[PDB]
Amino acid sequence: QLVESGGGLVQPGGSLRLSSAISGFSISSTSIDWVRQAPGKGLEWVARISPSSGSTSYADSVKGRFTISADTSKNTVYLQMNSLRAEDTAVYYTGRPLPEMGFFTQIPAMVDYRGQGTLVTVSSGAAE
């Protein structure tokens, strides 16, 4: 099981921290991706962490603004989300990626175990 939380409505420039509490496998063992889907848009890889060594990579769209991190004591990965914009509006979920030759990054559909996700909405509107 992967269960994510921390979402909801944020004003542009605001800040959020998502959490994914993971059970079924250790996270020091494998690698964990944040993935997101804006409505109408397709899956987008956000960020990857290998907790065992703490190496991270980010999609270009989020570099400098978002920070992926983990706690093997809690078996949970986080995504600090600073300087949020309207375009960050998406369902954000975690997955274990299955990278292979030719399929390293931007492989958001290439995941076995999958979270349900948490909706993040970035808007300065006053309507639904």
Partner: protein
């Protein structure tokens, strides 16, 4: 005659890559260019120096890509493209994996697909516990004529009978829509 001392140049220059899926590490650290070659002689020196696919540890891949095409689906020459999948069970690790991979290497460097050899970007062998795969990568899923010709000739070169069906799967579909559950655009 110069045939005595001249190397025999290949139509294309090729890059041989290796990848070990160490989930603890970064993919750039896990990926290695072994070398590039543009002759028959340089191909055999390289092939004879490396492990057979059947002797690799599970989670290991080889790739051969045309020089200038990155072993990445996002590459300009791959991202509108896809691959013919050959799926091998553990029994075929023993009997087919090595001979099928070498057939694939020589179909690429020998340009065995006639006019449509220009659609070929490279090939990949995956050594996994749950089963091994060989794939030929082509540049464009829409080139139905080139893709099905490459498929037919590959099948003939491998000596697969007509009852045995193989599929071609879009890279974008694989990475972006449906991972393991992605469906065939073509079959042969």
């Amino acid at each position: 005659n110069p045939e005595h001392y001249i190397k025999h140049p290949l139509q294309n220059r090729w890059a041989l890559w290796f990848f070990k899926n160490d989930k603890s590490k970064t993919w750039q650290a896990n990926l290695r260019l072994i070398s590039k070659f543009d002759t028959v002689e340089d191909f055999w020196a390289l092939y004879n120096h490396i492990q057979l696919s059947s002797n690799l540890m599970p989670g290991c891949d080889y790739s051969l890509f045309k020089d200038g095409i990155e072993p990445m689906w996002e590459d300009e020459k791959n991202k509108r493209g896809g691959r013919w999948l050959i799926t091998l069970n553990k029994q075929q690790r023993r009997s087919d994996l090595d001979r099928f991979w070498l057939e694939t290497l020589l179909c690429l460097i020998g340009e065995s697909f006639d006019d449509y050899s220009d659609d070929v970007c490279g090939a990949v062998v995956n050594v996994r516990a749950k089963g091994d795969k060989i794939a030929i990568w082509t540049t464009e899923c829409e080139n139905r004529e080139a893709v099905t010709h490459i498929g037919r000739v590959y099948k003939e070169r491998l000596g697969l009978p007509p009852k045995i069906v193989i599929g071609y799967q879009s890279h974008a579909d694989t990475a972006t829509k449906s991972g393991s559950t992605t469906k065939n655009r073509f079959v042969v």
